[PDB]
């Protein structure tokens, strides 16, 4: 995240940290994700696309730091990994960039509620906040596009949703952005999501609840002027989500 503040998982108790294990002993961070129900985490298909081997990923809930542990964290194995059939990437955008991971702990259980583990709410079929709404994004991604490491403390920042008309302007993303994506930027292009933030949440309040409105997906550079961040418009994937989380 460029900008933002450092936070603790109690401020984002539905954020999930997904890692991949390597032969050699290292486990590295892959993407962020959010908990929707006790056994399901939702993230982004491009995060798994080049290595769809579910037994090599680890999902942690209750983690405020990236490589050191937090008291209260839970560790899980990926029991099912559902990627999106019709996922495509072009020079910038990813289409249908949503994925579901079913988690199981080594004792056969799913997540348990704590002050550091909570689910986030889903929107109702195709219902979104209006452009202008301030939503918050969180994650362990880069702090400057030139960094080659990720911060060790969880960050969060506030960004506003912008309109498709504004994002589809030729000097922004033109038609690379579709009705299944949302764009959110900082009025003064100061904070935004960046590499390492993919799969984590865009949370806005809808009808009184904190809802997962978008998934960090892509963007050109990080916090660049007229280069909003693009998120998967979760309200338009509710059918797909249900199909697998029934």
């Amino acid at each position: 995240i460029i900008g933002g503040e450092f936070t603790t998982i109690e401020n984002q108790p539905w954020f999930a940290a997904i890692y991949r294990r390597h032969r050699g002993g290292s486990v590295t961070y892959v993407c962020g994700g959010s908990l929707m129900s006790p056994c399901w985490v939702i993230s982004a298909t491009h995060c798994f696309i080049d290595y769809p081997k579910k037994e090599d990923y680890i999902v942690y809930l209750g983690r405020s730091r990236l490589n050191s542990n937090t008291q209260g964290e839970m560790k899980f194995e990926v029991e099912n990994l559902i990627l999106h059939k019709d996922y495509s990437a072009d020079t910038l955008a990813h289409h249908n960039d949503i994925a579901l991971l079913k988690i199981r702990s080594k004792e056969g259980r799913c997540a348990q509620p704590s002050r550091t583990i909570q689910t986030i709410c889903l929107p109702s079929m195709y219902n979104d906040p209006q452009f202008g709404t301030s939503c918050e994004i969180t994650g362990f991604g880069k702090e400057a596009s030139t960094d080659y490491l990720y911060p060790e403390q969880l960050k969060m920042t506030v960004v506003k949703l912008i309109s498709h008309r504004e994002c589809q302007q030729p000097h922004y993303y033109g038609s690379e952005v579709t009705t299944k994506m949302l764009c959110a930027a900082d009025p003064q292009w100061k904070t935004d999501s960046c590499q390492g933030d993919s799969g984590g949440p865009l949370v806005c309040s809808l009808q009184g609840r904190m809802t997962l409105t978008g998934i960090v997906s892509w963007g050109r550079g990080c916090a660049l002027k007229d280069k909003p961040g693009v998120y998967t418009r979760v309200s338009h994937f509710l059918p797909w989500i249900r199909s697998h989380t029934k």
Binding site: E10, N11, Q12, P13, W14, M36, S37, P38, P113, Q118, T119, I120, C121, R209, M210, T211
Partner: peptide
């Protein structure tokens, strides 16, 4: 106790 989606 149980989950209340959205609550901190």
């Amino acid at each position: 106790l149980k989950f209340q989606c959205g609550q901190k």
